[PDB]
Amino acid sequence: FSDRVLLTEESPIRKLVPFAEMAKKRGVRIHHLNIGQPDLKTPEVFFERIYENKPEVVYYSHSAGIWELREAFASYYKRRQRVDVKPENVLVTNGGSEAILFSFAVIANPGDEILVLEPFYANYNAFAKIAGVKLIPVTRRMEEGFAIPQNLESFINERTKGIVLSNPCNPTGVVYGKDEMRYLVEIAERHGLFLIVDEVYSEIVFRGEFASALSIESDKVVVIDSVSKKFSACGARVGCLITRNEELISHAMKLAQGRLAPPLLEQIGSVGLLNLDDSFFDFVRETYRERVETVLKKLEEHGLKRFTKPSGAFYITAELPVEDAEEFARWMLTDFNMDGETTMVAPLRGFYLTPGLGKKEIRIACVLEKDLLSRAIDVLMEGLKMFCS
Amino acid sequence: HHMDVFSDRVLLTEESPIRKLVPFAEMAKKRGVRIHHLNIGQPDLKTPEVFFERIYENKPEVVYYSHSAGIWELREAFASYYKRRQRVDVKPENVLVTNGGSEAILFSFAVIANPGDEILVLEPFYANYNAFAKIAGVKLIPVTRRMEEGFAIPQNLESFINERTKGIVLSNPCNPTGVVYGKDEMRYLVEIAERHGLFLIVDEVYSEIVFRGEFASALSIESDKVVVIDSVSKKFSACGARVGCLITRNEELISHAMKLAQGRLAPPLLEQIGSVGLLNLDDSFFDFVRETYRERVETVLKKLEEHGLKRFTKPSGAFYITAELPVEDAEEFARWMLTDFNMDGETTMVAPLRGFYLTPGLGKKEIRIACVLEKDLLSRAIDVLMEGLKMFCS
């Protein structure tokens, strides 16, 4: 088999599944705070639009996506992100996942390098490995508030072709403002690199004023978005690649054509999601705000010191007073259960490329109703207390 | 201001000869010309109602990411399909649901080959494989087949194997030749794979659309080096579903493919729910589909013969007809058909075959015809095409 897949060890999160399944067999209710799967009901408009526009033939749509959906994304950015985008700048893909893969393949050759801000959304490494691109980590520290490090330029070389990050960020929850993004765009332009900004969590912003990378008119910016987290439509597999660089889009379109098209029914339903009013986004933003706040308060009241207050998204990264976080996560499932309940968290080690980093850190996904989440944290800290003594 | 340095992968890629005809086609519709599209493999048949019904009946409250390998029931649906219809014993654990056959091919390539490695392909072939090969950084090596030899597997196939060769890929029934390799031919091809430690990737998307001979799935030959790709696209006219699969008995390969499926998270949920219904369709449905395409293919073959065209292939499967025209450049004729020609305000669009070959110069005078219109329209579409071909010589 290929080195690409032989060198890939399985995710620390996935490695806990066997232990979790074994716990359910013993009659234990597990609180899943390890996966970024929203629990919110998918808006009914998604299903209504599909039912009302049932096509007689489920055909391959235009490779770049149904024209109406390209318009729907364009209008969303103007109305919600206050960015002027044309439908021609939008390329509909099979979720953000594919938009990332295309971006990587269009800008870099096999063996080339793409800078990534550590810790980062682990799945980028999967798309990099498929495209044969090397992903180069640029470490950020919790103690610095996971800021963009000053030595960013030093990692650039002849093989460097781009920089990729998420904003709001998964798993740190940091939100880079207009000033920070412009700085990052300026570096991309000075060194002729493309800036891939994954904005899947835009709308889920609590502190500061969020500015899309497209707000900074540059030919090197590529924004990735999706209907997944924003509308709780993860199973739709509908996302997009947005950029003003007509040449890049035209190159990405050859890849979209080999693939033929994104899912038809999901695109039809996505048009309805993107047209949702302001009240919907207020509800989603505030639901996650209250959840994040609830966890933060619970962590603080149980004496946990080193954790980050996110400005966006629904993840909380924290440092535990343990030698190995992954061992503790497994222990929670195997050797622990408060009142027949346990809590499953994601070890953060899988979000770093640099070996040794994130050994005592974990990520908490706020994807449960606030009261259950409060209870899930109580179980987690009671378990943390016994683990030590 | 600095230039955009894009990857060689995408800079070297010229746009498809078929796609290069779209601008000329769009300009023809503006002039008031009804175009008969025989250039794309998009079926025109109604998607069976069961697909929509299953979705409506099992509407989930949350459109969640399913298990990476696909919903368990769909994995069972594919497994049962192969046992009932293909007479092959497959377990759900052997099935990995993907975003259409397209992705199953991409994963196959990434799992067996490193960037820079080689995969043999039987030319002419489904052009899109080259797209997945470029994304994975794999070099696709052509093994030319001739129409005069009935597009058979050439005897010099082993001479193309080297240290960098990691697999062989083809479609059965084949797109665009329409050849259908039987049990004997497949065994031979599997024996070569095993002797040289290569994986055999057989794209069986057109299985069911078989007219001549008895079709045998590559899985019928129990080997640890066979990987079958299938889809709900052409078989059930559900191209927009983007639901396919990778099937193999090699537990290690599927386990490695699973890591790639996990990065991607999952295939489309609603489409998987609807696909379970399509896969459970009775024998009557497949009889109707197979015979609908048989009568269409026959109609075109008769019309081509009646208009004096000599060199064309009679396919054993799929719905494509490959033919050699008496012209210097087929692609020039295809464009001409749209720009400078229209019988009774009608014209026909065909796909130049040049884009289906990697070896430069091959398929310059050849075209592909997709039988994706009702037999009477198809008959008319060929009349328009031959009247245009007759004037073109002048």
Break chain A into its structural domains and give their ranges.
1-41+276-389, 42-275
Q: Where are the alpha helices (DSSP H) in A53-151?
A: 67-79, 95-107, 123-131
Pick A251's closest partner by Cβ from B10, B63, B103: B10
**Is B375 in contact with B382 (CB distance < 8 Å)?**
no
Which among B299, B368, B358, B292 is positioned nearest to B131, based on CA atoms? B358
**Is A76 in contact with A229 (CB distance < 8 Å)?**
no
Which among B254, B286, B334 is positioned nearest to B24, based on CA atoms? B334
**Is A173 in contact with A308 (CB distance < 8 Å)?**
yes
Architecture of domain A42-275: 3-Layer(aba) Sandwich (3.40)
* Chain A residue with Cα closest to B114: A2
Q: Which CATH number fits domain A1-41+276-389: 3.30.160.70, 3.30.70.1150, 3.30.2350.10, 3.90.1150.10?
A: 3.90.1150.10
Q: Which two tokens stand for residue B112?
A: 């067996």
**Is B307 in contact with B386 (CB distance < 8 Å)?**
yes
DSSP B317: B
Query: B72 CB near a chain A CB, below 8 Å?
Result: no
User: Is the CB of B7 less than 8 angstroms away from the CB of A112?
Assistant: yes
* Chain A residue with Cα closest to B128: A258
- State the structure-solving technique: X-ray
Pick B128's closest partner by Cβ from A38, A237, A258: A258
Strand partners, A205: A312
Which among B299, B87, B333, B90 is positioned nearest to B214, based on CA atoms? B87
What is the stated resolution of the deposited model, in angstroms? 2.5
Q: Where are the alpha helices (DSSP H) in chain B?
A: 8-11, 22-30, 50-57, 72-84, 100-112, 128-136, 183-195, 251-264, 269-279, 283-306, 330-339, 375-392
Query: A159 CB near a chain B CB, below 8 Å?
Result: no
> Nearest 5 degrees, angle CA B329-CA B331-CA B334?
115
Distance CA B222, CA A10 (A): 29
**Is A107 in contact with B7 (CB distance < 8 Å)?**
yes
Distance CA A167, CA A149 (A): 16
DSSP A116: E
Strand partners, B244: B98, B231
Distance CA A213, CA A166 (A): 11
Task: Report CA Rg, chain B.
Answer: 21
Pick B47's closest partner by Cβ from A42, A57, A127: A57
Amino acid at A43: P
Architecture of domain B1-46+281-394: Alpha-Beta Complex (3.90)
Distance from CA of A221 to the nearest CA of B (A): 12
Distance CA A286, CA A206 (A): 8
Three-state secondary structure call for residue B31: coil
Residues of A in contact with B112 (CB under 8 A): 1-2
* Chain B residue with Cα closest to A98: B264
User: Is the CB of A234 less than 8 angstroms away from the CB of B64?
Assistant: yes
Distance from CA of B12 to the nearest CA of A (A): 10
Distance CA A345, CA A321 (A): 15
Determine the topology of domain B47-280 in CATH: Aspartate Aminotransferase; domain 2 (3.40.640)
Amino acid at B66: S
| Residue B29: φ, ψ to 5° | -65, -30
CB pairs under 8 A between A and B: 218
DSSP structure string for A310-356: -SBSSEEEEE-SSS-HHHHHHHHHHS--BTTEEEE-EEGGGG-SSTT
Determine which helix (DSSP H) or strand (DSSP E) holds B369, and give its type and residue range. Answer: strand B366-370
